[PDB]
Subunit: 322 residues, 2 copies
C-alpha cells in the first residue's frame, strides 16, 4: 500500500514518484522501466525536459511486458511557456501524448506563470528559451486565466485527467481561483528546508490543492548556494540539523529531507539511477520525524531560491518571484 493523495479532481496521486527532470535521454527509458519494476507508479515529466519520448519507451515497455496496467500509473507533464496562447494549449497536449505514446496523461501543469512567444513545433522542440530571435526573449500578452480556461477545456475530453500549476506564487493562485471554474488539483514548487514558504503551503493546502516539491535536497553547487544571503550556507546533506536527525533514526540526510516533505503531505519526485537509493526513496515513509525535528528544521528557512526565472532574461527581468 503506497501512500497517495486524493486530488480535488477525484483522482489519486502517488505521494512518492520518480522525477524525470534532469534524467539523461540515453539512460531514461531504462531508468523509467527499472523504476516501474521497483514499484514506482508516478512519473514526473515536462515538455521542456526533452526526454518525453524516452519516458514513453519505459512506460510502454512495462505495459507490454504486463508489469503494470495504465490506470496503475500516474503520468505528469507540463505545458511549457511557449504554449500559453489558448490556441496552442490543446496542440501542446497532443504533442505530449504523441511523444510519450500515451492515450492520456493524469496531470497537466502550467510549468511557469510565463508566456514566451510561440515557436512552431517544427521550428524547434523543446523550444526552451528560444523565442524566434536568436538569444532574445519575447513574450505573449496572454493573462494566466486565459491559459487556465484552455486547460479546463482539456479535462472535458479526458486527454488530461487533472490539471494544475507550477511555480505560481500564492498571490497568483489567489487571483486565479477568482476566475477558475475548476480549481487546480496540484501546485508544484521548489521546496526544501532553505525555501519553506510556510504561508504559501498553508494557504494552498487550505484550498484542497495538493503540493508537489522539486529540488527537495536544496542547493548542491556553487551557483545554487550563491543565492543565499548568509555568510557560509552548507548543503543540506552537511547541515548539522539534518545530519543529527538523520543519525538519530539511522537514515540518510536524503531520506530525512524527503520525509520532511512527504510526512507533511507534500508529494516528492526524487530521481536515482542507483538500485539501493531507488528503493530507499520509494520506502522513505518508513520512519517518522517528531514535533521537535520539525521545529528544528523550520529554523533553516532563509528564502533561498535557486530556480528563479529572474536569471533567465537580463533584458526583461522575469519577476514572478520578485
Amino acid at each position: 500500500h503506497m501512500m497517495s493523495i486524493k486530488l480535488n479532481s477525484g483522482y489519486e496521486m502517488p505521494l512518492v514518484g520518480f522525477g524525470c527532470w534532469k534524467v539523461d535521454n540515453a539512460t531514461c527509458a531504462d531508468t523509467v522501466y527499472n523504476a516501474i519494476k521497483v514499484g514506482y507508479r508516478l512519473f514526473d515529466a515536462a515538455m521542456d525536459y526533452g526526454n518525453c519520448k524516452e519516458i514513453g519507451e519505459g512506460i510502454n515497455r512495462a505495459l507490454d511486458e504486463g508489469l503494470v496496467a495504465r490506470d496503475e500509473l500516474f503520468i505528469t507533464s507540463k505545458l511549457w511557456n511557449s504554449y500559453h496562447d489558448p490556441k496552442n494549449v490543446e496542440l501542446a497536449l497532443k504533442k505530449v501524448l504523441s511523444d510519450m505514446k500515451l492515450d492520456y496523461i493524469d496531470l497537466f501543469l502550467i510549468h511557469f506563470p510565463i508566456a514566451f512567444k510561440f515557436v512552431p513545433f517544427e521550428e524547434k522542440y523543446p523550444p526552451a528559451f528560444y523565442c524566434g530571435d536568436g538569444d532574445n526573449f519575447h513574450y505573449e500578452d496572454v493573462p494566466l486565466l486565459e491559459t487556465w480556461k484552455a486547460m479546463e477545456k482539456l479535462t472535458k475530453g479526458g486527454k488530461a485527467k487533472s490539471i494544475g500549476i507550477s511555480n505560481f506564487s500564492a498571490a497568483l493562485i489567489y487571483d486565479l481561483l477568482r476566475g477558475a471554474e475548476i480549481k487546480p488539483a496540484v501546485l508544484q514548487i521548489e521546496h526544501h528546508p532553505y525555501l519553506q514558504q510556510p504561508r504559501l503551503i498553508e494557504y494552498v493546502q487550505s484550498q484542497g490543492i495538493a503540493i508537489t516539491a522539486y529540488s527537495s535536497f536544496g542547493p548542491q553547487s556553487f551557483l545554487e548556494l550563491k543565492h543565499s544571503k548568509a555568510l557560509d550556507t552548507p548543503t543540506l546533506f552537511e547541515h548539522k540539523t539534518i545530519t543529527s536527525i538523520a543519525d538519530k533514526y539511522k537514515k540518510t540526510p536524503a531520506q530525512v529531507l524527503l520525509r520532511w516533505a512527504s510526512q507533511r503531505d507534500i508529494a516528492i519526485i526524487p530521481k536515482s539511477n542507483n538500485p539501493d537509493r531507488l528503493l530507499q526513496n520509494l520506502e522513505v515513509n518508513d520512519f517518522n520525524l517528531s514535533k521537535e525535528d520539525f521545529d528544528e528544521i523550520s529554523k533553516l528557512d532563509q528564502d533561498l531560491r535557486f530556480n528563479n526565472p529572474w536569471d533567465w532574461d537580463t533584458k526583461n527581468r522575469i519577476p514572478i518571484f520578485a
Copy 2:
C-alpha cells in the same frame, strides 16, 4: 520636484499622506500644508477623513491660495468595490465626499475583493462584509476591476489610475491584459523591506512608485514582524544615524531621501511647519553609492502591513 507619469501628468515627488490623520484636525492640517507648499495629498476611501481633506482643499481653493490643476489628489478603491459595476460608484462617492469633480490618481488599494457593502449600510466598510465580523469575498479577477478603472479615465473623473500593494508577479500578469499601464504603484517601502527586484521591474516598466511607512516599524507589533533578535527603529539604527551625522541631517531626512533620490515618491505627514518645509526640500542633499550599499544591508523582509493578519479564517495570501 515631480515625476511625469506614463499617463502624461506630473505627480509631485513629495506629498502629504493623510493616512492616520485624525478627523478633528485633518481639514486645518491639509489647509496649512497647502500654504506651506504641498500639492499632492494621498487619501483613501478606508481612511474615513475624505470629507475633512476636501474641506481643507476647498478652503484653500476658495481663498485662491492655489488652483485645482496645481493640486494632485490621490484616492484609493477599497476592497469592497472591486466588482466592476461598483468601481464608478466608488469614485463618485469619493468625489462627493471630498467635493471635487475629479481625482488625479485612483488606486486599487489592495489586490483583495471583499463582499460589496452598500454605502448606506456602512461607510467606510473597512473589514465589514455584511455578516458581523465574518469576512466574505467576491470572485472578481483583478483584471476585471482594472478594466473598470481604465473606463474611469475616459470620462476625466480620474486623470490617472494605479495600484497599491500588488506584488511584481501580479503586475506582470495584469499588464498582459491591460490597455492602460498602471501609472503608479504604492507599497510599503523602507530599509527593512526594500524588495529590490520589485522596484527594479516596476520602474523598468515606466511605472512610478510611491512609498508609505518610509520610517519603518515604530511600535511593538510592527517590530514584532522581524525574525531578528532585537531590531531597532530606523531612527536609531547605526547605519542611518551615521549617515545623518556626517551630512548634518536628521535620520528622518536620510530615510526619506533614500526613497526620493531613487525617484520613489514619498507621502509623509506633519503638523510642524518647519518639518513640513523640510520635507519639501528633496534635493537638499544626496546619498552616496556607499551610503546605498550600507543601507541595502538592512533589508530583512520586515513587512508590518500584511493582510495575512486580517482574516484568521481565510488567510489573505497576497504577500505569501
